[PDB]
Structure 1
């Protein structure tokens, strides 16, 4: 059926469909156009996604997962992940291959399985609206996502039962959403995307010649670990330091408080985008060697600005680089476009506006443009959106490690994709049976300072003197921005097998297994839902039967009043537990003993 567009966000997720030529954002079951990217695993075997997960995070801190996009496709020993380990209320662990995973109720889980739960909610949302199955999606990622991050996101799509037709870069999608109606003016635009977790800047040319729109990304830069979460973190730190002075208490040793404080800090932050001052007012934050304590701290807009100004400044540097790479000056920009909730902060808008010397547009929805853009991208693939052309780029240099630990660039950053690069490799020694190619992403001159994609071993090479064999290695980057390395003996043309060691990501076996796990979860969810309906029916029966007992009054035999009241009580207890059969049972017993009472009612 339809190709849905899914903005899979660090904080919030959004799904859009292509309704002919006009894109629509869909409301979820709770009635909302966006869904918090939060996943909770309950004590009773249910998975909660979004607002329901959000509400119970305080009672279930270790099993409520959020900001998973900031772990996906990363290594456990990464500096960013290591910092998050001591901050998150859930447990971050090392997978067998060294990847950053999470542990939930004693089960090791890969970030793609967790993100798949969000993707599933979005899929179902679309299916609820369309009244038919959805099997295909366009999924978004930050422009500055690396190979492992992109492939791990694509794997999340697959685990969610989605065929991922395209992985689209977030600013590119926003550009598609903007270029849909609007100019149209052979324009050159800067897309500034600051979200809950990631920051992207893309310079994009949109020229329309003979009713054929061409969207070309000139340059892209960013930081995949800079976002609203970091803004929140600065305010949280300020609050604990203030509380440590005014009460003498370190409040961080309390996980219930932290979580309510995290929500408090984010709420204050958002409040300060329209107020000049607010209060972080949390009563009963925790009880000490006395009794229930309450934090009440005033925070001005200026205080907040002062706490996050350096984070805002860190987003200005990549603008300079991207302008350099695009070969443009600030005055070459026709339009500045802000995307992401974090751009609603007056200071962000102000700093961006004074950098470009130009006001950002006000007619772009910073929450929905990306989802809408994904949906448009899907439309281009089916054909339902004609005369649109997309030329995106890869954001990072791809190279190999050479003698001395030095980087040799094979494909430079900002190269248009899809792209191919071939190079012939050979042996360095007599009877060499294997040659290793160490592939990396990054701009640094030394291999150790860049992101390793893995050791690509061309094994099983026929005996020969030095430099005999001619193995042509081809490096492909597809439309998704993802690398594919293949090899071939130059001379004959017969392929050459490639083994990847020391790499990150899920293998085919893990993925197949995880697909089945997600199907099983979906089935358990059905069971949790059914038990909720049963509890609902049980409560209706309680009430109905009490009204009837009440109405009969004096006329009811004492024997029957005793028995019915006992069975009502028994049902009430079952209804408080989590066992569907026991509820059905006590309901059935209640109906039997109250059968003559109900009959005359």
Structure 2
């Protein structure tokens, strides 16, 4: 008759991390990779013997900075001369070259100098997400929905499809990240009448606010705003500067010139930052941090909140701007949706909830998984081929 169809997958192809889900048995399963991680770093590393993707690439970045590529999404579908590209290049340890006004990343790989287009690096990340899904399903996967930022233009959307095609995926559709987060909560299944939804997306390096209107399951992007210089890495930087000062006070030593010590400090700071989202204090314990000195200290959630206070408050400026652009008042927003790991920060949640006069925030779907969750829901809908009954 008709052989059973393979499940289609939903992929959130993120700037820093990617996530894959599948809708089966009336529910979404966010698929962990083989290191048990529900999100996979959007990193690709090159050596004389291997190409590493995901956790394996990110875990060896310290000693291979020139040949470990990350942030390809910031280059995808852009011209080499684009001012965004020119500024971003100063922060990256890997080489970005100009090939006919199109950026390419250039690395040492298997004994040669090789250059890749951003879509080729993204296809490597998509190949890892496809393999993660196939390890769980136990069969080859063909169909996928891939998400993009709402502000992506035609060139950026086509380059994302091209990345999916290089990876051997059939791209069912390119959908906006804020739309996918709304779909995850079933905000397009509430019936007739207009609903205004605000998506608050705080990432590792950027912050995006989107206002959508949903009428009879139809989405319209009403306004987008944000801050390209606001993310999780900025909170990590504030903790780094704080502990560098603390080591200076306590041991009369400036550690800031030993890259290993600074890196070990930053790694510890990011974990302490995560602990502070669930606990009112967190310990920091580093052995032989600098000059054989053990650094055993702590930080309260109140001190961390004070350290990043201006940064957390600045998330409300793009919210007010988006509301002005959508020509809406805060009471007119029906639903608030949180996206990004940085939204687990209690103070960030409290500031936004206080701004919307005590309103509940939708945060029941892990914010670092909501986009892939919605993409997986849509992928299952898009492959249906029901023939009507008489």
In the superposition, the TM-score normalised over structure 2's length comes to 0.82
Matched, 1:371 2:376: no
Alignment CA distance shift 1:265-1:319 (3 Å) = same
Which residues of structure 2 form unaligned runs of 5+?
Answer: 1-5
Aligned to 1:104: 107
Structure 1 residue 260, shift from structure 2 partner: 2.7
1:169 maps to: 176
Pairwise CA distance, 1:360: 1.1
1:375–1:362: structure 2 CA closer, same or farther, 3 Å change rule? closer
Partner in structure 2 of residue 231 of structure 1: 235
Q: Would the alpha carbon gap of residues 229 and 201 (structure 1) be closer, same or farther in structure 2, given more than 3 Å must change?
A: same
Matched, 1:42 2:47: yes
Determine if contact 2:188/2:214 at 8 Å carries over to the other structure. Answer: no
Structure 1 residues 86-235: aligned runs within 5 Å: 87-88=91-92, 90-105=93-108, 106-179=113-186, 183-184=190-191, 186=193, 187-208=195-216, 213-224=217-228, 226-235=230-239
Helix, strand or coil: the match of 2:130? helix
- CA displacement at 1:214 relative to structure 2: 3.3
Shift of the 109–38 alpha-carbon distance from structure 1 to 2, 3 Å rule, reads same
How many angstroms apart in 2 are the aligned matches of 1:265 and 1:329? 38
Q: Shift of the alpha carbon at 1:121?
A: 0.8
Which residue of 24, 32, 43 maps to 2:29?
24
Q: Residue 83 and residue 308 in structure 1: after superposition, are their counterparts in 2 closer, same or farther (change >3 A)?
A: farther
| Aligned 8 A contact 2:30 2:38 in 1 | yes
Whether 1:331 aligns to 2:331 is yes
| 1:70 and 1:197 in contact (8 A); partners too | no
Query: Where does residue 361 of structure 1 map in the other structure?
Result: 362
Compute the displacement of 1:141 (Å): 1.6
Note the 1:112-511 alignment, pairs <5 A: 112-179=119-186, 183-184=190-191, 186=193, 187-208=195-216, 213-224=217-228, 226-243=230-247, 247-249=252-254, 251=256, 253-286=257-290, 291-296=291-296, 298-357=298-357, 358-383=359-384
What does residue 70 of structure 2 align with? 66
Structure 1 portions without partners, runs of 5+: 387-601
* Cα distance change of structure 1 residues 231 and 109 upon mapping to structure 2, 3 Å threshold: farther
1:361-385 deviation per Cα after TM superposition (whole angstroms, max 9, x unaligned): 3433312221121122223433369
Distance 1:49 1:165, change over 3 A: same
> How many Å separate the matches in 1 of 2:239 and 2:103?
27
Contact kept in structure 2, 1:243 and 1:249, CA below 8 Å: yes
Say if 2:143 and 2:170, in contact at 8 Å, map to a contact too: yes
Contact 1:177 1:370 in 2 (8 A): yes
Q: Which has the higher contact order (CA 8 A, sep 6+)?
A: 2
- The alignment partner of 2:261 has SS state of helix
Tell me the distance in 1 between the aligned counterparts of 2:163 and 2:227. Answer: 22
The answer on whether the counterparts of 1:71 and 1:111 sit within 8 Å (CA) in structure 2 is yes
User: Residue 48 of structure 1 aligns to a residue in which SS?
Assistant: strand
Check conservation: 1:376, 1:385, Cα contact below 8 A: no
Judged with a 3 Å threshold, the aligned counterparts in structure 2 of structure 1 residues 22 and 130 are, in CA distance, closer, same or farther, namely same
Aligned to 2:59: 55
Distance of aligned partners of 1:385 and 1:223 in 2 relative to their CA distance in 1, 3 Å threshold: farther
Aligned to 2:224, the other structure's residue is in SS state strand
Q: What do residues 32-89 of structure 1 show as CA deviations (whole Å, max 9, x unaligned)?
A: 3322323222342x2222333333334434433334434444566666656655544x
Of 2, 7, 13 in structure 2, the residue corresponding to residue 8 of structure 1 is: 13
In the alignment, the residues of structure 2 paired with residue 207 and residue 71 of structure 1 have an alpha-carbon distance, to the nearest angstrom, of: 34
Does the C-alpha gap of structure 1 residues 49 and 146 become closer, same or farther in structure 2, counting only changes over 3 Å? same
Structure 1 residues 364, 31: closer, same or farther in 2, change over 3 A? closer
Q: Do the aligned residues in 2 keep the contact of 1:20 with 1:384 (CA within 8 Å)?
A: no
State how far apart, in whole Å, the 2-side matches of 1:257 and 1:99 are: 37
Following superposition, the deviation at residue 266 of structure 1 comes to 1.2
TM-score for the superposition, normalised by structure 1: 0.56
Deviations 1:192-248 (A, max 9, x none): 11122332222233344xxxx334433333345532223323333444455456544
Distance in 1 between residues matched to 2:146 and 2:227, nearest whole Å: 19
Distance 1:70 1:230, change over 3 A: farther
- For 1:74-119, what per-residue CA distance to the aligned partner results, in whole angstroms no more than 9, with x for missing partners? 566666656655544x324332345554332243333332222221
